[PDB]
Amino acid sequence: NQQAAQQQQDTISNKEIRQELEMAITEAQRQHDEFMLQNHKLQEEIKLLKNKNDGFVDRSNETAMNEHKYLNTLAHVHQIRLDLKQTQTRYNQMSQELQ
Amino acid sequence: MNQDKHPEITDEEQELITVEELSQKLELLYKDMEQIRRENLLFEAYLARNRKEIAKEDEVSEDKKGKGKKKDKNVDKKSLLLTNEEKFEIAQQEQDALKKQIDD
């Protein structure tokens, strides 16, 4: 029973594919839970800091700013951080070339 | 009643549909995790930057820790997570701080 097994190509009938997708989803869920923990601890620290430094009064009576606007500003923050990274990358490149 | 006899879907078709749904959910979960990781980085930067205020202000007030026996208010955990307005304020403040960082 040695020779006949080699050519048994693994034609996954979506069962092994299903299992791989499930394991990938489980890993994504664990990463999501880790990100939840990180974000929740960060938000708790930020809220305690804001209570300690900024006023405890909440400006909820203002116009309902769109969470779409909040996500736009968050994406803008991510883009600005990335741009900072690449800008310093070029800056160091030219600085080292000059040096 | 006209009982529309649905055609028998091969288990291969069901399996492929399940694979497609799993791939879509994996894409959604990866997008969510990327968003959450970006938010984690933003909030970590915010907290670290203000820890200078945290450390500077905490040190000043340590000697002021008197005999205050104020009853500890029971605030639910739901109030320890940033609301929409507070999250937007943090995002804008970190956006301004980051813009200053790129400038400098």
Coordinates of N, CA, C and O in Angstrom, one line a residue, chain A residues 1-98:
Chain A
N1 N 0.8 -1.2 0.0 CA 0.0 0.0 0.0 C 0.8 1.3 0.0 O 0.5 2.2 0.7
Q2 N 1.9 1.3 -0.8 CA 2.8 2.5 -0.8 C 2.6 3.3 -2.0 O 2.4 4.5 -2.0
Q3 N 2.8 2.6 -3.2 CA 2.8 3.4 -4.5 C 1.5 4.0 -4.8 O 1.4 5.2 -5.2
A4 N 0.4 3.3 -4.5 CA -1.0 3.8 -4.9 C -1.4 5.0 -4.2 O -2.4 5.7 -4.7
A5 N -0.8 5.4 -3.1 CA -1.3 6.6 -2.3 C -0.7 7.9 -2.8 O -1.3 8.9 -2.5
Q6 N 0.4 7.9 -3.5 CA 1.0 9.2 -3.9 C 0.1 10.0 -4.8 O -0.1 11.2 -4.5
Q7 N -0.4 9.5 -5.8 CA -1.2 10.3 -6.8 C -2.6 10.6 -6.2 O -3.4 11.2 -7.0
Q8 N -2.9 10.4 -5.0 CA -4.2 10.7 -4.4 C -4.2 12.2 -4.1 O -4.1 12.7 -3.0
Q9 N -4.5 13.0 -5.2 CA -4.5 14.5 -5.0 C -5.6 14.9 -4.1 O -6.7 14.3 -4.1
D10 N -5.3 15.8 -3.2 CA -6.3 16.3 -2.2 C -7.3 17.2 -2.8 O -7.1 18.5 -2.7
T11 N -8.3 16.7 -3.4 CA -9.4 17.4 -4.0 C -10.4 17.8 -2.9 O -11.4 17.1 -2.7
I12 N -10.1 18.8 -2.1 CA -10.9 19.2 -1.0 C -12.3 19.5 -1.5 O -12.6 20.3 -2.3
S13 N -13.3 18.7 -0.9 CA -14.7 18.9 -1.2 C -15.3 20.0 -0.3 O -16.4 19.8 0.3
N14 N -14.6 21.1 -0.2 CA -15.2 22.2 0.6 C -15.3 21.9 2.1 O -15.8 22.7 2.9
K15 N -14.9 20.7 2.4 CA -14.9 20.3 3.9 C -13.7 20.7 4.5 O -13.7 21.4 5.6
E16 N -12.5 20.4 3.9 CA -11.2 20.9 4.4 C -11.2 22.4 4.2 O -10.6 23.1 5.0
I17 N -11.7 22.9 3.1 CA -11.8 24.4 2.9 C -12.7 25.0 4.0 O -12.4 26.1 4.5
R18 N -13.8 24.3 4.3 CA -14.7 24.9 5.4 C -13.9 24.9 6.7 O -14.1 25.8 7.5
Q19 N -13.2 23.8 7.0 CA -12.4 23.8 8.2 C -11.3 24.9 8.3 O -11.1 25.5 9.3
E20 N -10.6 25.1 7.2 CA -9.6 26.2 7.1 C -10.3 27.5 7.3 O -9.8 28.4 8.0
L21 N -11.5 27.7 6.7 CA -12.2 29.0 6.9 C -12.6 29.2 8.3 O -12.5 30.3 8.8
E22 N -13.1 28.1 8.9 CA -13.5 28.2 10.3 C -12.3 28.5 11.2 O -12.4 29.3 12.2
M23 N -11.1 27.9 11.0 CA -10.0 28.2 11.8 C -9.5 29.6 11.6 O -9.1 30.3 12.6
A24 N -9.5 30.1 10.4 CA -9.2 31.4 10.1 C -10.1 32.4 10.8 O -9.7 33.4 11.3
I25 N -11.4 32.1 10.8 CA -12.4 32.9 11.4 C -12.2 32.9 12.9 O -12.4 33.9 13.6
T26 N -11.8 31.7 13.5 CA -11.5 31.7 14.9 C -10.3 32.5 15.3 O -10.3 33.2 16.3
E27 N -9.2 32.5 14.4 CA -8.1 33.4 14.7 C -8.5 34.8 14.5 O -8.0 35.7 15.3
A28 N -9.3 35.2 13.6 CA -9.8 36.5 13.4 C -10.6 37.0 14.6 O -10.5 38.1 15.1
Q29 N -11.4 36.0 15.2 CA -12.2 36.3 16.4 C -11.3 36.5 17.6 O -11.5 37.4 18.4
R30 N -10.2 35.7 17.7 CA -9.3 35.9 18.8 C -8.6 37.3 18.7 O -8.4 38.0 19.7
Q31 N -8.1 37.6 17.5 CA -7.5 38.9 17.3 C -8.5 40.0 17.5 O -8.2 41.1 18.1
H32 N -9.8 39.8 17.2 CA -10.8 40.8 17.4 C -11.0 41.0 18.9 O -11.2 42.1 19.4
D33 N -11.0 39.9 19.7 CA -11.1 40.0 21.1 C -9.9 40.7 21.8 O -10.1 41.5 22.7
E34 N -8.7 40.4 21.3 CA -7.5 41.1 21.8 C -7.6 42.6 21.5 O -7.3 43.4 22.3
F35 N -8.1 42.9 20.3 CA -8.3 44.3 19.9 C -9.4 45.0 20.8 O -9.3 46.2 21.1
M36 N -10.4 44.3 21.1 CA -11.5 44.7 22.0 C -10.9 45.0 23.4 O -11.1 46.1 23.9
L37 N -10.0 44.1 23.9 CA -9.4 44.4 25.2 C -8.5 45.6 25.2 O -8.6 46.4 26.1
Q38 N -7.7 45.7 24.1 CA -6.8 46.8 24.0 C -7.6 48.1 23.9 O -7.3 49.1 24.6
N39 N -8.6 48.2 23.0 CA -9.4 49.4 22.8 C -10.1 49.7 24.1 O -10.3 50.9 24.4
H40 N -10.7 48.7 24.8 CA -11.4 49.0 26.0 C -10.6 49.6 27.1 O -10.9 50.5 27.8
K41 N -9.4 49.0 27.3 CA -8.5 49.5 28.3 C -8.0 50.9 27.9 O -7.9 51.8 28.8
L42 N -7.7 51.1 26.6 CA -7.3 52.5 26.2 C -8.4 53.5 26.4 O -8.2 54.6 26.8
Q43 N -9.7 53.1 26.1 CA -10.8 54.0 26.3 C -11.1 54.3 27.7 O -11.4 55.4 28.1
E44 N -10.9 53.3 28.6 CA -11.1 53.5 30.0 C -10.0 54.5 30.5 O -10.4 55.4 31.3
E45 N -8.8 54.3 30.1 CA -7.7 55.2 30.5 C -8.0 56.6 30.0 O -7.8 57.6 30.7
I46 N -8.5 56.7 28.7 CA -8.7 58.0 28.2 C -9.9 58.7 28.9 O -9.9 59.9 29.1
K47 N -10.9 57.9 29.2 CA -12.1 58.5 29.9 C -11.7 59.0 31.3 O -12.1 60.0 31.8
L48 N -10.9 58.2 32.0 CA -10.5 58.6 33.4 C -9.6 59.8 33.3 O -9.7 60.8 34.1
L49 N -8.7 59.9 32.3 CA -7.9 61.1 32.1 C -8.7 62.3 31.7 O -8.4 63.4 32.2
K50 N -9.7 62.1 30.9 CA -10.6 63.3 30.5 C -11.4 63.7 31.7 O -11.6 64.9 32.0
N51 N -11.9 62.8 32.6 CA -12.6 63.2 33.8 C -11.6 63.9 34.7 O -12.0 64.9 35.4
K52 N -10.4 63.5 34.8 CA -9.4 64.1 35.7 C -8.9 65.5 35.2 O -8.6 66.3 36.1
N53 N -8.8 65.7 33.9 CA -8.2 66.9 33.4 C -9.3 67.8 32.8 O -9.4 69.0 33.2
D54 N -10.0 67.4 31.8 CA -11.1 68.1 31.2 C -12.3 68.1 32.1 O -12.4 67.3 33.1
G55 N -13.2 69.0 31.9 CA -14.4 69.1 32.7 C -15.3 67.9 32.6 O -15.4 67.2 31.5
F56 N -16.0 67.5 33.7 CA -16.9 66.4 33.7 C -18.2 66.6 33.0 O -18.9 65.7 32.7
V57 N -18.4 67.9 32.6 CA -19.7 68.2 31.9 C -19.6 67.6 30.5 O -18.6 67.7 29.8
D58 N -20.7 66.9 30.1 CA -20.8 66.3 28.7 C -21.7 67.2 27.8 O -22.8 67.6 28.2
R59 N -21.2 67.5 26.6 CA -21.9 68.3 25.7 C -22.8 67.5 24.8 O -22.7 67.6 23.5
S60 N -23.7 66.7 25.4 CA -24.6 65.9 24.6 C -25.7 66.7 24.0 O -26.4 66.3 23.0
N61 N -26.0 67.9 24.5 CA -27.1 68.8 24.0 C -26.7 69.4 22.6 O -27.6 69.9 21.9
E62 N -25.5 69.3 22.2 CA -25.1 69.8 20.9 C -25.7 69.0 19.7 O -26.4 68.0 20.0
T63 N -25.5 69.5 18.5 CA -25.9 68.7 17.4 C -25.3 67.3 17.3 O -24.1 67.2 17.7
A64 N -26.1 66.3 16.9 CA -25.6 65.0 16.9 C -24.5 64.8 15.8 O -24.9 64.5 14.6
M65 N -23.3 64.9 16.2 CA -22.2 64.7 15.2 C -22.2 63.3 14.7 O -22.4 62.3 15.5
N66 N -22.0 63.1 13.4 CA -22.2 61.8 12.8 C -21.0 60.9 13.1 O -19.9 61.3 13.1
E67 N -21.4 59.7 13.5 CA -20.3 58.7 13.7 C -19.6 58.4 12.4 O -18.5 57.9 12.4
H68 N -20.3 58.6 11.3 CA -19.6 58.6 10.0 C -18.5 59.7 10.0 O -17.4 59.4 9.5
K69 N -18.8 60.9 10.5 CA -17.8 61.9 10.6 C -16.6 61.5 11.6 O -15.5 61.7 11.3
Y70 N -17.0 60.8 12.7 CA -16.0 60.3 13.6 C -15.1 59.2 12.9 O -13.9 59.2 13.1
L71 N -15.7 58.3 12.1 CA -14.9 57.4 11.4 C -14.0 58.0 10.3 O -12.9 57.6 10.1
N72 N -14.6 59.1 9.7 CA -13.8 59.8 8.7 C -12.5 60.4 9.4 O -11.4 60.4 8.9
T73 N -12.7 61.0 10.6 CA -11.6 61.6 11.3 C -10.6 60.5 11.8 O -9.4 60.8 11.8
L74 N -11.2 59.4 12.2 CA -10.3 58.3 12.6 C -9.4 57.8 11.4 O -8.2 57.5 11.5
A75 N -10.1 57.6 10.2 CA -9.3 57.2 9.0 C -8.3 58.3 8.7 O -7.2 58.0 8.2
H76 N -8.7 59.6 8.8 CA -7.7 60.7 8.6 C -6.6 60.6 9.5 O -5.4 60.9 9.2
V77 N -6.8 60.2 10.8 CA -5.7 60.1 11.8 C -4.8 58.9 11.4 O -3.6 59.1 11.4
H78 N -5.4 57.8 11.0 CA -4.6 56.7 10.5 C -3.7 57.1 9.3 O -2.5 56.8 9.2
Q79 N -4.3 57.8 8.3 CA -3.6 58.2 7.2 C -2.5 59.2 7.5 O -1.4 59.2 6.9
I80 N -2.8 60.1 8.4 CA -1.8 61.1 8.8 C -0.6 60.4 9.6 O 0.6 60.8 9.4
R81 N -0.9 59.4 10.4 CA 0.2 58.7 11.0 C 1.0 57.9 10.0 O 2.3 58.0 10.1
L82 N 0.4 57.3 9.1 CA 1.1 56.6 8.0 C 2.0 57.6 7.2 O 3.1 57.3 6.9
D83 N 1.4 58.7 6.9 CA 2.1 59.7 6.1 C 3.3 60.3 6.9 O 4.4 60.5 6.4
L84 N 3.1 60.5 8.2 CA 4.3 60.8 9.1 C 5.4 59.7 9.0 O 6.5 60.0 8.8
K85 N 5.0 58.4 9.0 CA 5.9 57.4 8.9 C 6.7 57.5 7.6 O 8.0 57.5 7.6
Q86 N 6.0 57.5 6.5 CA 6.7 57.5 5.2 C 7.5 58.8 5.0 O 8.6 58.8 4.3
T87 N 7.0 60.0 5.5 CA 7.8 61.2 5.4 C 9.1 61.2 6.1 O 10.1 61.6 5.6
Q88 N 9.0 60.6 7.4 CA 10.3 60.4 8.1 C 11.2 59.4 7.4 O 12.4 59.5 7.4
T89 N 10.6 58.4 6.7 CA 11.3 57.5 5.9 C 12.2 58.2 4.9 O 13.4 58.0 4.8
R90 N 11.5 59.0 4.0 CA 12.3 59.7 3.0 C 13.2 60.7 3.7 O 14.4 60.9 3.2
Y91 N 12.8 61.4 4.8 CA 13.7 62.3 5.4 C 15.0 61.6 5.9 O 16.1 62.1 5.6
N92 N 14.9 60.5 6.5 CA 16.1 59.7 6.9 C 16.9 59.3 5.7 O 18.1 59.3 5.7
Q93 N 16.2 58.9 4.6 CA 16.9 58.4 3.4 C 17.8 59.5 2.9 O 19.0 59.3 2.7
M94 N 17.2 60.7 2.7 CA 18.0 61.8 2.2 C 19.1 62.3 3.2 O 20.2 62.7 2.8
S95 N 18.7 62.3 4.5 CA 19.7 62.7 5.5 C 20.9 61.7 5.4 O 22.1 62.2 5.5
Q96 N 20.7 60.4 5.4 CA 21.8 59.5 5.3 C 22.6 59.6 4.0 O 23.8 59.5 4.0
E97 N 21.9 59.9 2.9 CA 22.6 60.1 1.6 C 23.5 61.3 1.8 O 24.7 61.3 1.4
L98 N 23.0 62.4 2.3 CA 23.8 63.6 2.5 C 25.0 63.3 3.4 O 26.1 63.8 3.2

